[PDB]
C-alpha cells in the first residue's frame, strides 16, 4: 500500500491538473476584468435590507387595507339592503332573475325554473383569473342538494341582487381586485365577477361538495376560536348503524375545526378515558387532526352508560389551564343516541354559572328516550341535533357555529373586525390565496327594536380573495441575488410567503389506498384543507432560527447576521453560509415580514447604458440566426414588459423579446427599464467574453462545453451544438449550480443523475462551476458564473495515468461533498456516474460518516407527491437526507473490519474544489455486506406528533373573543 | 327477545324492521313467522 506521501502527490497533481483546466478555459479572470474594466456602463448601488422591509411591509399594508375598505362597503350594503326586505311567498309571478353557476351554457335548454329566471352570460376571458370571466353580474352557487326555488332561498336571491352593483364599483375602483363573494347561512355563495363553476353536478358525471359553511373563510368570520372537547357514547347500545354514524359524524365535525381551536376526543361507557395519545386538548392542525380521526375510526361498542363519569371528564379536560388553549369558547359536543340520565348534580357542580355550552347529538334511528339529552342541551346554553342518516351529516355537523355566533351579533359594531385567513387553494382554481372575512348582522327592527328573535344569528359572510402572487409582486426579488429572499410569517409560525411553498396540500403519513374496494364511477371526495407550512419546516432549523421566529411571532422588529446550513435547489447538498435576516412587523395586520440577504449580496449592479449606439450593438448580440458566434443563448423568462408574456418555450420568447426590443426602442414608457437594462448590459459583457475569449479556441482538449449563466437573465453556451445538452432553468436564479458556487469561494462539481432518461452521463460531462468575483471600489461583488463541461473519457484517461482499469487489488474513486461517483476506476462503477457512493459501496461509506469526514442532515418535505401503499398519486410526506462535509481535515487513513477481515483506505480532499478521492482495498477481496445507504427522499410518516405536543412549538393566539353574552336567550333547542 | 334481542346491530345501512328488539315487537316477528311471510328473511337476520 502507498505511503501518505505518493498519495498525497498523486492528489496534488490530480487536483492541479482539473483547477489549472477549468480556470484557463473558463474564463473567471478574463469576464473578472472584463467587469472591472468598464466600471462606467454601470453603478454599483446598495441593498439597505432594513428600508426594503419597511417599504415592503408598507404597501402589503396598503394593499390590505385597500381590500378590507372594500369589505365595510358590502358589509354596509347588505345589512342595509336585506334590513328593508319584505319576505314575500308568491314568486311564480314575479319571477327572480340570476345566473345560476354550474348549469350548462347550451342555449337550448330553456330551464326556466318555477318561480326564476335564467341569465345567458357572455363569458369574455380575462387575466387574473385563468377562466372565462362575465363582469356584468354575480354567479349564484347553491349546493347540490338544496333545492333552488325554496321561499328561504327565492327570498335570498331576491336581496343579494343589490350586491351587484356595490361588487361593480369594488371592482371599478380597484380593478387589481379577485373573488369578491358574500357567503350565506343558507348556503348560497353569490360572487363577482361571474363565473361557470368548475363542476356541475350530473352534467358531467363528477358531482361537486361544496358548501359555503364549512369554508376556512367562512367559519373564521362567523365565530371565535373555540376549546372543543368531543365526547363520545361507546356504549353497547351504540353498536350496529349507530356506531358507525357516530365516527363519520365525528370525524366531519373535526373538519370544521382551524388551527386556532383546541380540541380533544374522549370516549365513556361506565369509564372515561381518552381515545387517542394525547390526554389534554391539542392544536387542531391538520396532524393532530389526522391523530384523532384515526383513533376515532379504531372505537368498537361494549358497556354500560354512565353520563356521569364522562362528564366530570369532560370539564375536568377543560380546566386543565396548564396546556397551551384557545380560552374563547368552552363547549362540550355529546354524540349518544339516548338515554334516561341526565346528570344534574354534574352540572350543578361543575358549570354552575353556565361557562361551558352543550351540543347533543342523537345520532341513529333507535327506540331510545330522547328527553334528557334536549335537557341536557337545553339548560347548558347549547343545542340539540338529530342525525338519522349520512346525508343528515354535513348539515348538522356545520350548524353549532350558528350558537356560537350569538355573542360576537350582540356587540355589534365592536365584533366588526376584518379577519384574514390561513393560505388554502382557491376553489374556483386561482392558486394559493387568503381571504378576508367579515360578517354580516341582521338587523330588522333595529331603529324601533321589535324583534330581536330571528335577529341573534348573521345573514352570512363577506370575503373577497387576495392571492399569494399578488403579494409576491410588492416584494420583488430582481435585486437581491439567488440567496436572498423575502418570507412573511403568521402569528402561529405558519409561513404566508417562502420560496419553499408550494401549491400542492400538505401531506399527513403514508398514503394507503385499496383497489379492491373502489367502484369506477362513485366520484369520491378530495380535500378541503389549507396549506399550513410551518416556518420551521420549510427551511433547516438551527435553534437560532427558533428564537427568530419566536421573536416576529410577537412582533418585533430586529435584526442577526449568523452562519446557517442551507439546502440547495436540488436536494442533494448542503452549504454553510453566512446570512442576514432582518424583520419587522406589518403594521396594520398581524404578520410579520423578514428579508434574508446573504453579505456578498449587500451591494447590486444598475446599468447606466443610455446611448443607442451601445443599446442596440448589444440587443444585436442576442438573435438566434447570429448564435454561431455568439453561442446558444438563454433569456430569462421575467416580466420585462406587460405586454410580452413568459411563454415557457424559451426560442419563442427570445424572438419575442427581440422584436419587442427592436419594434419599440428602449424609451418603453411602460416597461421594467432596470430589467431590459440590466439584460442588455449582460449580454454584452457575455458576448464580450464569447468573442474576445472562448473564440480564440474553438475546441480544447478536455472541454466539451462552456457556459456562463449570469444575474440579469443571460445564459450563453458557446459551441451551438453543447447548447442542445443545457438541461438548466433559464431563469438564472433557479439554477442551483449558480446558487451552489455563489456560497463557495472555491470550484464546485456538479454531479449528474443516474438512470436518467437522457443525454447525462457521456454525452454531457460533468459541470464544473465557479462565481466571477470583482471589487469595484471596495465593495464584493458577485454578478455571474462561469463553467465548464468536462469530458468523461479525458478525465478517465487522465485517471488512469495501482490503479488501473479494472483492477482487482484496490479502488480509487472520487466523490464531490454529497457522496455522490464522478471518476471512478472499474468501467463498472464509472458507467454509474453520478450516482451515490453508499449504493455501490455501503461499508466504506459508513464508515466514512463514521470517522467524521461526511457529515450529514435530515430533513421533511410535507408536500409531496406519493405512489399510495399497499393497505394516481397521493400527497405524502418523505423524509430527505443531505451529506456535506463537516471536518475541515484533509486527509483520512484507516482500516475498516467488515469482521474476520479488514480493508485499508485513505481519503485525502483536493484542496480549493469540493472533490475527496479514496483509495481502499477492493470489495472482491472480502464477501462482506451490512445494507445499503441510500440518499433519496424515502416516503415517511415521522415526526410522531404525541410527543410535539408534550413541547409544542410557542404561539400567539388571537385576543378578540366573543361569548358569554348576558342578554343572549337560550330557549332554542 | 333472548336469542336475537339486541342482536341485529348489522353496521350496514339496511332497514331490517322485523326483529327481536321489544316485546310488541317480537311478538309482530313471531306472529310473521307464522303466517309464513318472509320468514325466511327473519331466519337469515338471525343467522347473520
Same mark, same amino acid.
Not at chain 1, 314575500?88 to 318561480?115: H, M, Q, T
Not at chain 1, 342538494?145 to 336581496?159: A, K, R
Not at chain 1, 358574500?182 to 353569490?190: I, M
Given at each position: 500500500?502507498?505511503?501518505?506521501?505518493?498519495?498525497?502527490?498523486?492528489?496534488?497533481?490530480?487536483?492541479?491538473?482539473?483547477?489549472?483546466?477549468?480556470?484557463?478555459?473558463?474564463?473567471?479572470?478574463?469576464?473578472?476584468?472584463?467587469?472591472?474594466?468598464?466600471?462606467?456602463?454601470?453603478?454599483?448601488?446598495?441593498?439597505?435590507?432594513?428600508?426594503?422591509?419597511?417599504?415592503?411591509?408598507?404597501?402589503?399594508?396598503?394593499?390590505?387595507?385597500n381590500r378590507?375598505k372594500a369589505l365595510?362597503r358590502l358589509?354596509?350594503?347588505?345589512?342595509?339592503?336585506?334590513?328593508?326586505?319584505?319576505?314575500?311567498?308568491?314568486?311564480?309571478?314575479?319571477?327572480?332573475?340570476?345566473?345560476?353557476?354550474?348549469?350548462?351554457? *347550451?342555449?337550448?335548454?330553456?330551464?326556466?325554473?318555477?318561480?326564476?329566471?335564467?341569465?345567458?352570460?357572455?363569458?369574455?376571458?380575462d387575466?387574473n383569473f385563468?377562466?372565462?370571466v362575465s363582469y356584468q353580474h354575480a354567479?349564484?352557487?347553491?349546493?347540490? *342538494?338544496?333545492? $333552488?326555488?325554496?321561499?328561504?332561498?327565492?327570498? $335570498?336571491?331576491?336581496?343579494?341582487?343589490?350586491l351587484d352593483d356595490v361588487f361593480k364599483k369594488n371592482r371599478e375602483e380597484d380593478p387589481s381586485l379577485l373573488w369578491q363573494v358574500?357567503?350565506?347561512?343558507?348556503?348560497?355563495?353569490?360572487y363577482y365577477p361571474a363565473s361557470?363553476?368548475?363542476?356541475?353536478?350530473?352534467?358531467?358525471?363528477?358531482?361537486? /361538495?361544496?358548501?359555503?359553511?364549512?369554508?376556512?373563510?367562512?367559519?373564521?368570520?362567523?365565530?371565535?376560536?373555540?376549546?372543543?372537547?368531543?365526547?363520545?357514547?361507546?356504549?353497547?347500545?351504540?353498536?350496529?348503524?349507530?356506531?358507525?354514524?357516530?365516527?363519520?359524524?365525528?370525524?366531519?365535525?373535526?373538519?370544521?375545526? @382551524?388551527?386556532?381551536?383546541?380540541?380533544?376526543?374522549? @370516549?365513556? #361507557?361506565?369509564?372515561?378515558?381518552?381515545?387517542?395519545?394525547?390526554?389534554?386538548?391539542?392544536?387542531?392542525?391538520?396532524?393532530?387532526?389526522?391523530?384523532?380521526?384515526?383513533?376515532?375510526?379504531?372505537?368498537?361498542?361494549?358497556?354500560?352508560?354512565?353520563?356521569?363519569?364522562?362528564?366530570?371528564?369532560?370539564?375536568?379536560?377543560?380546566?386543565?389551564?396548564?396546556?397551551?388553549?384557545?380560552?374563547?369558547?368552552?363547549?362540550?359536543?355529546?354524540?349518544?343516541?339516548?338515554?334516561?340520565?341526565?346528570?344534574?348534580?354534574?352540572?350543578?357542580?361543575?358549570?354552575?354559572?353556565?361557562?361551558?355550552?352543550?351540543?347533543?347529538?342523537?345520532?341513529?334511528?333507535?327506540?331510545?328516550?330522547?328527553?334528557?339529552?334536549?335537557?341536557?342541551?337545553?339548560?347548558?346554553? &347549547?343545542?340539540?341535533?338529530?342525525?338519522?342518516?349520512?346525508?343528515?351529516?354535513?348539515?348538522?355537523?356545520?350548524?353549532?357555529?350558528?350558537?356560537?355566533?350569538?355573542?360576537?351579533?350582540?356587540?355589534?359594531?365592536?365584533?366588526?373586525?376584518?379577519?384574514?385567513?390561513?393560505?388554502?387553494?382557491?376553489?374556483?382554481?386561482?392558486? /394559493?390565496?387568503?381571504?378576508?372575512? /367579515?360578517?354580516?348582522?341582521?338587523?330588522?327592527?333595529?331603529? $324601533?327594536?321589535?324583534?330581536?328573535?330571528?335577529?341573534?344569528?348573521?345573514?352570512?359572510?363577506?370575503?373577497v380573495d387576495?392571492?399569494?402572487?399578488?403579494?409576491?409582486?410588492?416584494?420583488?426579488?430582481?435585486?437581491?441575488?439567488?440567496?436572498?429572499?423575502?418570507?412573511?410569517?403568521?402569528?402561529?409560525?405558519?409561513?404566508?410567503?417562502?420560496?419553499?411553498?408550494?401549491?400542492?396540500?400538505?401531506?399527513?403519513?403514508?398514503?394507503?389506498?385499496?383497489?379492491?374496494?373502489?367502484?369506477?364511477?362513485?366520484?369520491?371526495?378530495? +380535500?378541503?384543507?389549507?396549506?399550513?407550512?410551518?416556518? !420551521?419546516?420549510?427551511?433547516?432549523? #438551527?435553534?437560532?432560527?427558533?428564537?427568530?421566529?419566536?421573536?416576529?411571532?410577537? =412582533?418585533?422588529?430586529?435584526?442577526?447576521?449568523?452562519?446557517?446550513?442551507?439546502?440547495?435547489?436540488?436536494?442533494?447538498?448542503?452549504?454553510?453560509?453566512?446570512?442576514?435576516?432582518?424583520?419587522?412587523?406589518?403594521?396594520?395586520?398581524?404578520?410579520?415580514?423578514?428579508?434574508?440577504?446573504?453579505?456578498?449580496?449587500?451591494?447590486?449592479?444598475?446599468?447606466?447604458?443610455?446611448?443607442?449606439?451601445?443599446?442596440?450593438?448589444?440587443?444585436?448580440?442576442?438573435?438566434?440566426?447570429?448564435?454561431?458566434?455568439?453561442?446558444?443563448?438563454?433569456?430569462?423568462?421575467?416580466?420585462?414588459?406587460?405586454?410580452?408574456?413568459? +411563454?415557457?418555450?424559451?426560442?419563442?420568447?427570445?424572438?419575442?423579446?427581440?422584436?419587442?426590443?427592436?419594434?419599440?426602442?428602449?424609451?418603453?414608457?411602460?416597461?421594467?427599464?432596470?430589467?431590459?437594462?440590466?439584460?442588455?448590459?449582460?449580454?454584452?459583457?457575455?458576448?464580450? !467574453?464569447?468573442?474576445?475569449?472562448?473564440?480564440?479556441?474553438?475546441?480544447?482538449?478536455?472541454?466539451?462545453?462552456?457556459?456562463?449563466?449570469?444575474? &440579469?437573465?443571460?445564459?450563453?453556451?458557446?459551441?451551438?451544438?453543447?447548447?442542445?445538452?443545457?438541461?438548466?432553468?433559464? $431563469?438564472?436564479?433557479?439554477?442551483?449550480?449558480?446558487?451552489?458556487?455563489?456560497?463557495?469561494?472555491?470550484?464546485?462539481?456538479?454531479?449528474?443523475?443516474?438512470?436518467?432518461?437522457?443525454?447525462?452521463?457521456?454525452?454531457?460531462?460533468?459541470?464544473?462551476?465557479?462565481?466571477?468575483?470583482?471589487?469595484?471600489?471596495?465593495?464584493?461583488?458577485?454578478?455571474?458564473?462561469?463553467?465548464?463541461?468536462?469530458?468523461?473519457? @479525458?478525465?478517465?484517461?487522465?485517471?488512469?495515468?495501482?490503479?488501473?482499469?479494472?483492477?482487482?487489488?484496490?479502488?480509487?474513486?472520487?466523490?464531490?461533498? =454529497?457522496?455522490?461517483?464522478?471518476?471512478?476506476?472499474?468501467?463498472?462503477?464509472?458507467?454509474?456516474?453520478?450516482?451515490?457512493? =453508499?449504493?455501490?459501496?455501503?461499508?466504506?461509506?459508513?464508515?466514512?460518516?463514521?470517522?467524521?469526514?461526511?457529515?450529514?442532515?435530515?430533513?421533511?418535505?410535507?408536500?409531496?407527491?406519493?405512489?399510495?401503499?399497499?393497505? +394516481?398519486?397521493?400527497?405524502?410526506?418523505?423524509?430527505?437526507?443531505?451529506?456535506?462535509?463537516?471536518?475541515?481535515?484533509?486527509?483520512?487513513?484507516?482500516?475498516?473490519?467488515?469482521?474476520?477481515?479488514?480493508?485499508?483506505?485513505?481519503?485525502?480532499?483536493?484542496?480549493?474544489?469540493?472533490?475527496?478521492?479514496?483509495?481502499?482495498?477492493?470489495? &472482491?477481496?472480502?464477501?462482506?455486506?451490512?445494507?445499503? !445507504?441510500?440518499?433519496?427522499?424515502?416516503?415517511?410518516?415521522?415526526?410522531?406528533?404525541?410527543?410535539?405536543?408534550?413541547?409544542?412549538?410557542?404561539?400567539? =393566539?388571537?385576543?378578540?373573543?366573543?361569548?358569554?353574552?348576558?342578554?343572549?336567550?337560550?330557549?332554542?333547542? | 327477545?333472548?336469542?336475537?334481542?339486541?342482536?341485529?346491530?348489522?353496521?350496514?345501512?339496511?332497514?331490517?324492521?322485523?326483529?327481536?328488539?321489544?316485546?310488541?315487537?317480537?311478538?309482530?316477528?313471531?306472529?310473521?313467522?307464522?303466517?309464513?311471510?318472509?320468514?325466511?328473511?327473519?331466519?337469515?337476520?338471525?343467522?347473520?
Open positions: 500500500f502507498p505511503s501518505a506521501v505518493t498519495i498525497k502527490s498523486w492528489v496534488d497533481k490530480m487536483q492541479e491538473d482539473l483547477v489549472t483546466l477549468a480556470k484557463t478555459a473558463s474564463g473567471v479572470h478574463q469576464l473578472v476584468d472584463i467587469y472591472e474594466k468598464y466600471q462606467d456602463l454601470y453603478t454599483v448601488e446598495p441593498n439597505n435590507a432594513r428600508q426594503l422591509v419597511e417599504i415592503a411591509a408598507r404597501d402589503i399594508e396598503k394593499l390590505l387595507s378590507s365595510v358589509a354596509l350594503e347588505a345589512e342595509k339592503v336585506q334590513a328593508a326586505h319584505q319576505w314575500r311567498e308568491d314568486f311564480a309571478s314575479n319571477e327572480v332573475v340570476y345566473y345560476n353557476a354550474k348549469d350548462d351554457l *347550451d342555449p337550448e335548454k330553456n330551464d326556466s325554473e318555477p318561480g326564476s329566471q335564467r341569465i345567458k352570460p357572455v363569458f369574455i376571458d387575466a385563468r377562466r372565462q354567479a349564484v352557487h347553491i349546493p347540490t *342538494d338544496i333545492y $333552488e326555488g325554496s321561499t328561504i332561498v327565492l327570498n $335570498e336571491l331576491n336581496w343579494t341582487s343589490a358574500f357567503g350565506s347561512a343558507t348556503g348560497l355563495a353569490r361557470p363553476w368548475v363542476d356541475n353536478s350530473r352534467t358531467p358525471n363528477k358531482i361537486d /361538495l361544496y358548501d359555503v359553511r364549512r369554508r376556512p373563510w367562512y367559519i373564521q368570520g362567523a365565530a371565535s376560536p373555540k376549546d372543543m372537547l368531543i365526547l363520545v357514547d361507546v356504549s353497547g347500545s351504540v353498536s350496529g348503524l349507530t356506531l358507525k354514524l357516530i365516527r363519520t359524524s365525528v370525524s366531519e365535525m373535526l373538519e370544521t375545526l @382551524s388551527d386556532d381551536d383546541f380540541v380533544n376526543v374522549a @370516549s365513556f #361507557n361506565s369509564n372515561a378515558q381518552d381515545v387517542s395519545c394525547f390526554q389534554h386538548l391539542v392544536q387542531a392542525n391538520v396532524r393532530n387532526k389526522k391523530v384523532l380521526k384515526d383513533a376515532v375510526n379504531n372505537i368498537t361498542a361494549k358497556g354500560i352508560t354512565d353520563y356521569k363519569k364522562g362528564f366530570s371528564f369532560a370539564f375536568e379536560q377543560l380546566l386543565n389551564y396548564n396546556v397551551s388553549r384557545a380560552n374563547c369558547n368552552k363547549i362540550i359536543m355529546l354524540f349518544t343516541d339516548g338515554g334516561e340520565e341526565r346528570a344534574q348534580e354534574i352540572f350543578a357542580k361543575y358549570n354552575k354559572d353556565k361557562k361551558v355550552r352543550v351540543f347533543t347529538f342523537s345520532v341513529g334511528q333507535h327506540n331510545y328516550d330522547r328527553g334528557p339529552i334536549q335537557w341536557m342541551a337545553c339548560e347548558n346554553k &347549547g343545542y340539540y341535533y338529530e342525525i338519522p342518516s349520512i346525508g343528515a351529516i354535513r348539515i348538522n355537523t356545520q350548524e353549532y357555529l350558528d350558537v356560537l355566533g350569538r355573542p360576537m351579533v350582540l356587540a355589534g359594531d365592536k365584533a366588526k373586525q376584518v379577519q384574514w385567513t390561513n393560505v388554502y387553494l382557491d376553489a374556483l382554481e386561482l392558486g /394559493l390565496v387568503i381571504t378576508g372575512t /367579515l360578517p354580516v348582522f341582521n338587523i330588522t327592527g333595529q331603529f $324601533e327594536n321589535k324583534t330581536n328573535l330571528k335577529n341573534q344569528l348573521i345573514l352570512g359572510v363577506m370575503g387576495v392571492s399569494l402572487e399578488d403579494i409576491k409582486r410588492l416584494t420583488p426579488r430582481f435585486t437581491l441575488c439567488p440567496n436572498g429572499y423575502y418570507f412573511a410569517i403568521d402569528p402561529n409560525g405558519y409561513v404566508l410567503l417562502h420560496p419553499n411553498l408550494q401549491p400542492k396540500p400538505i401531506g399527513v403519513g403514508i398514503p394507503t389506498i385499496n383497489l379492491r374496494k373502489r367502484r369506477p364511477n362513485v366520484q369520491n371526495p378530495k +380535500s378541503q384543507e389549507p396549506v399550513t407550512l410551518d416556518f !420551521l419546516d420549510a427551511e433547516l432549523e #438551527n435553534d437560532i432560527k427558533v428564537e427568530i421566529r419566536n421573536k416576529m411571532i410577537d =412582533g418585533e422588529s430586529g435584526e442577526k447576521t449568523f452562519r446557517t446550513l442551507v439546502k440547495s435547489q436540488d436536494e442533494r447538498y448542503i452549504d454553510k453560509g453566512n446570512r442576514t435576516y432582518t424583520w419587522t412587523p406589518v403594521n396594520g395586520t398581524d404578520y410579520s415580514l423578514a428579508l434574508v440577504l446573504p453579505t456578498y449580496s449587500f451591494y447590486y449592479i444598475k446599468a447606466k447604458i443610455e446611448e443607442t449606439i451601445t443599446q442596440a450593438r448589444y440587443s444585436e448580440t442576442l438573435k438566434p440566426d447570429n448564435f454561431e458566434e455568439s453561442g446558444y443563448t438563454f433569456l430569462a423568462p421575467r416580466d420585462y414588459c406587460s405586454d410580452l408574456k413568459p +411563454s415557457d418555450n424559451n426560442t419563442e420568447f427570445l424572438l419575442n423579446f427581440n422584436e419587442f426590443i427592436d419594434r419599440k426602442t428602449p424609451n418603453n414608457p411602460s416597461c421594467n427599464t432596470d430589467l431590459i437594462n440590466r439584460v442588455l448590459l449582460d449580454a454584452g459583457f457575455t458576448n464580450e !467574453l464569447v468573442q474576445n475569449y472562448w473564440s480564440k479556441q474553438k475546441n480544447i482538449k478536455g472541454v466539451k462545453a462552456r457556459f456562463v449563466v449570469t444575474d &440579469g437573465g443571460i445564459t450563453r453556451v458557446y459551441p451551438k451544438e453543447a447548447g442542445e445538452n443545457w438541461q438548466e432553468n433559464p $431563469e438564472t436564479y433557479e439554477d442551483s449550480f449558480y446558487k451552489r458556487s455563489l456560497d463557495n469561494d472555491n470550484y464546485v462539481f456538479t454531479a449528474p443523475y443516474f438512470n436518467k432518461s437522457g443525454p447525462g452521463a457521456y454525452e454531457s460531462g460533468i459541470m464544473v462551476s465557479k462565481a466571477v468575483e470583482i471589487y469595484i471600489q471596495g465593495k464584493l461583488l458577485k454578478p455571474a458564473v462561469v463553467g465548464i463541461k468536462i469530458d468523461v473519457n @479525458s478525465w478517465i484517461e487522465n485517471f488512469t495515468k495501482d490503479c488501473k482499469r479494472n483492477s482487482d487489488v484496490m479502488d480509487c474513486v472520487i466523490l464531490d461533498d =454529497g457522496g455522490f461517483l464522478l471518476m471512478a476506476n472499474h468501467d463498472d462503477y464509472t458507467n454509474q456516474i453520478g450516482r451515490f457512493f =453508499g449504493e455501490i459501496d455501503p461499508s466504506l461509506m459508513r464508515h466514512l460518516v463514521n470517522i467524521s469526514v461526511y457529515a450529514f442532515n435530515k430533513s421533511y418535505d410535507y408536500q409531496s407527491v406519493c405512489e399510495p401503499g399497499a393497505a +394516481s398519486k397521493q400527497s405524502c410526506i418523505t423524509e430527505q437526507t443531505q451529506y456535506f462535509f463537516d471536518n475541515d481535515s484533509k486527509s483520512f487513513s484507516g482500516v475498516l473490519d467488515c469482521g474476520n477481515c479488514s480493508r485499508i483506505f485513505h481519503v485525502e480532499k483536493l484542496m480549493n474544489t469540493n472533490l475527496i478521492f479514496i483509495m481502499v482495498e477492493s470489495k &472482491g477481496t472480502c464477501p462482506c455486506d451490512t445494507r445499503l !445507504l441510500i440518499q433519496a427522499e424515502q416516503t415517511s410518516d415521522g415526526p410522531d406528533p404525541c410527543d410535539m405536543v408534550k413541547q409544542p412549538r410557542y404561539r400567539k =393566539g388571537p385576543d378578540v373573543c366573543f361569548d358569554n353574552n348576558v342578554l343572549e336567550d337560550y330557549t332554542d333547542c | 327477545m333472548q336469542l336475537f334481542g339486541g342482536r341485529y346491530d348489522f353496521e350496514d345501512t339496511e332497514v331490517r324492521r322485523s326483529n327481536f328488539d321489544n316485546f310488541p315487537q317480537a311478538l309482530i316477528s313471531v306472529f310473521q313467522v307464522l303466517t309464513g311471510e318472509d320468514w325466511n328473511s327473519v331466519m337469515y337476520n338471525g343467522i347473520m
